[PDB]
Each structure stands twice: as structure tokens, then as C-alpha cells.
């Protein structure tokens, strides 16, 4: 702004930047599906573990 002599367009785009300080909407996009997949998967992990643990002792 101290470079640009041509007035009040640096203040404009500075203020436009301060307008657009907000960002696109989005958060946790999986918290039901990540948990659901993990649940089904976890069950399967335990199934494998229990089978092989039994077999190990056998």
C-alpha cells in the first residue's frame, strides 16, 4: 500500500480480504460411517483373532 500511490484500492482489496476471512463450509464428514465401517471391521478382526487363538492352543 505504501508502494501503490494509486489511492484506495489497496484498502479496497484489504477490506475484501477481510471480508473473505471466512472459508468454505466442511467439518467432520464421517463420524457415523467411519465408525460403522470400523465396527463391522472390528468385529471381523475379533473373529479372526478368536479363531487363530483357539487354533494356536490346539
Amino acid at each position: 500500500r505504501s508502494v501503490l500511490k494509486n489511492t484506495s484500492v489497496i484498502d479496497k482489496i484489504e477490506s475484501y480480504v477481510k471480508q473473505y476471512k471466512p472459508v468454505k463450509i466442511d467439518a467432520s464428514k464421517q463420524l457415523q460411517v467411519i465408525e460403522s465401517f470400523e465396527k463391522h471391521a472390528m468385529t471381523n478382526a475379533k473373529e479372526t483373532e478368536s479363531l487363530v487363538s483357539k487354533e494356536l492352543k490346539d
Binding site: V3, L4, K5, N6
Partner: protein, 50 residues
């Protein structure tokens, strides 16, 4: 910024052509006579100081 710098150069060349216009004005006037007298007497003072 780029156009601003360009505009300063543009202003300078515009004002340059005004110097040309002013040059024609000076050499037209009997300033053409009167400043020659000034130069003449200045040479008298200077060359006498040699």
C-alpha cells in the same frame, strides 16, 4: 503498481513535449535578443576573471 509506474513515465514524456513547446516560445521572443546580451556580458565577466 505496474500502471502507476507507467503513468509516471507517461507524465514525464508528456511534460517533455511541453518543454519542446516552451523552447519554441523562448527562441521566438526578443528574449532571443535579451538573453544573448545576458550571455554576452556574462562572458565579459568570466573571461575577464581569467
Amino acid at each position: 503498481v505496474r500502471y502507476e509506474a507507467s503513468l509516471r513515465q507517461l507524465e514525464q514524456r508528456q511534460l517533455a513535449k511541453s518543454v519542446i513547446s516552451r523552447v519554441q516560445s523562448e527562441l521566438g521572443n526578443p528574449k532571443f535578443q535579451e538573453k544573448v546580451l545576458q550571455q554576452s556580458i556574462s562572458e565579459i565577466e568570466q573571461l575577464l576573471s581569467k
